[PDB]
Design a protein around this ligand. Structure first.
Ligand SMILES: [K+]
Ligand SMILES: [K+]
Ligand SMILES: [K+]
Ligand SMILES: [Mg+2]
Ligand SMILES: [Mg+2]
Length: 136
RNA sequence: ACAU
DNA sequence: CGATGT
């Protein structure tokens, strides 16, 4: 089982969990940063990992790319498969922004199609995903 | 347990 | 050490 180097890798970064959430997507081979989301003041790790995959799907579809997406998040991969983000984060004025983005990402999944393979990055074999923030 |  | 999730 080898890395598919022609791929997009995504990852979340946070200050606290729940806390400030951001994410980015990079070229798996070169590490070139392809997109970065502006920090969201309160969210969870798994909400951010979900948003990152969905953004990757939208980014690749816009560019007519058949590349797969790597994520290290078992949870977010399943949420994308199900088209449903099963977060426990409370809904209040401070979490409204992240919940709006998650709701909108789900809505995009339910109104669009894609063949993009969403693959588990095997951290135990390969080390940290190329999109990692280096904060742990 | 596993993945973050 | 704590949190988010299956
Ligand atoms: K990190
Ligand atoms: K990891
Ligand atoms: K746990
Ligand atoms: Mg991750
Ligand atoms: Mg990471």
């Amino acid at each position: 089982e080898e890395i598919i180097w022609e791929s997009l890798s995504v990852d979340v970064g946070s200050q606290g969990n729940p806390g400030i959430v951001e994410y980015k997507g990079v070229d798996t081979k070169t590490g070139e940063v392809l997109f970065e989301r502006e920090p969201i003041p309160i969210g969870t790790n798994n909400m951010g990992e979900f948003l990152a995959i969905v953004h990757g799907l939208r980014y690749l579809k816009e560019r007519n790319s058949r590349k797969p997406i790597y994520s290290d998040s078992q949870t977010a991969i399943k949420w994308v498969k199900d088209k449903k983000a099963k977060s426990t984060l409370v809904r209040n004025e401070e979490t409204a922004l992240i919940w709006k983005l998650v709701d909108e990402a789900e809505e995009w999944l339910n109104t669009h199609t894609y063949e993009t393979p969403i693959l588990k990055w095997q951290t135990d074999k390969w080390g940290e995903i190329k999109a990692d923030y280096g904060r742990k």
